[PDB]
Amino acid sequence: NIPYTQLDMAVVQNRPAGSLRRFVVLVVGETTRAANWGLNGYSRQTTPLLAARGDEIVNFPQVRSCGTSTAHSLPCMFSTFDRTDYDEIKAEHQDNLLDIVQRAGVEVTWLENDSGCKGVCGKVPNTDVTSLNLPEYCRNGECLDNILLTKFDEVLNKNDKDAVLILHTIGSHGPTYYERYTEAERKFTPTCDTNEINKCTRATLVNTYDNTVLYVDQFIDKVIRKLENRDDLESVVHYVSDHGESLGENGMYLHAAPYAIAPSGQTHIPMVMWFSKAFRQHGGIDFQCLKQKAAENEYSHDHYFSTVLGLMDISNSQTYRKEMDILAACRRP
Ligand SMILES: [Zn+2]
Numbered sequence: 001n002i003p004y005t006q007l008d009m010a011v012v013q014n015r016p017a018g019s020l021r022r023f024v025v026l027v028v029g030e031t032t033r034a035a036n037w038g039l040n041g042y043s044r045q046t047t048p049l050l051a052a053r054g055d056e057i058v059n060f061p062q063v064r065s066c067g068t069s070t071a072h073s074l075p076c077m078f079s080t081f082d083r084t085d086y087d088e089i090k091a092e093h094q095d096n097l098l099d100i101v102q103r104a105g106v107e108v109t110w111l112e113n114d115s116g117c118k119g120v121c122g123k124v125p126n127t128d129v130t131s132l133n134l135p136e137y138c139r140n141g142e143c144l145d146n147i148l149l150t151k152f153d154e155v156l157n158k159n160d161k162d163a164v165l166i167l168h169t170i171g172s173h174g175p176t177y178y179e180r181y182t183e184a185e186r187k188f189t190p191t192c193d194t195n196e197i198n199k200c201t202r203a204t205l206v207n208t209y210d211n212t213v214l215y216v217d218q219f220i221d222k223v224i225r226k227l228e229n230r231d232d233l234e235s236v237v238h239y240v241s242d243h244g245e246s247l248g249e250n251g252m253y254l255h256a257a258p259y260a261i262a263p264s265g266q267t268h269i270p271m272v273m274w275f276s277k278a279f280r281q282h283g284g285i286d287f288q289c290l291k292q293k294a295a296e297n298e299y300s301h302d303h304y305f306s307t308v309l310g311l312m313d314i315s316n317s318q319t320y321r322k323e324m325d326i327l328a329a330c331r332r333p
């Protein structure tokens, strides 16, 4: 019974003349938390493939989520609203980040493997891959995230337009944490190989969760592998989780704790970025500047909206905020 507000009706892309195609992948993580992320100095190396890439990967050790649950964080991070002003009803009744990006002429595709896109993806091309139920990847109606990679090349090769591809993963979601990885990532043992996580010790729970992080690491790595040798493409891979998780600290499990009293495990989330050779050469970013800002500054889901607009060279936007675009402070005139 309330009015919908279309936003940013003037947007266009303003790519430099003669530009290469720009292809951006937004990996939307799930449940993975900052405190168990190798690149953040966690005592275990849960991110070996990203770590081995050294400064090719920009890591952000101080990032906070908008919510402690998926249905809160996803619409909030894709909305113009910052956490402190976010309102579910207001956000549902206006254009979101992807509606605006698509209007600007960018090819947006959403690939879903996490039980639903929470109303964010309906107006752009979207496919839920979980129903494929491939025996290689899937059991009990959930699938290992690598299933998303089976549909990646089709999006990459669809046409020559600049693109934003969202890969919405199941990541570290519990209580079936054991389903989130394979034998190749089962490095921390013993494990809790049941949904009844109360029947496991919290040490074995942490082990199992850390193995899920190894799978996140290899997933991001495989996405980078699809793009890093495409010298004719300016590609960016951005990863951020939706929220963290509690692993029995003070008797707290799972997530969705009320934001104000939520433990740091649920609000402090990992975020990384990777940039292709052509992007680094032509994209205008000062990478030493960026490395320093990533290390020193606190960021949040609030930065997501304008960072993504900035990655597509979207001009004539009223919703864009240069101060909330992570890269703008390091972007050359
Ligand atoms: Zn309504």
Ligand SMILES: [Zn+2]
Residues within 6 Å of the ligand: 069, 070, 173, 255
């Ligand atoms: Zn959940």
Ligand SMILES: [Zn+2]
Residues within 6 Å of the ligand: 030, 031, 069, 070, 071, 242, 243
């Ligand atoms: Zn979630």
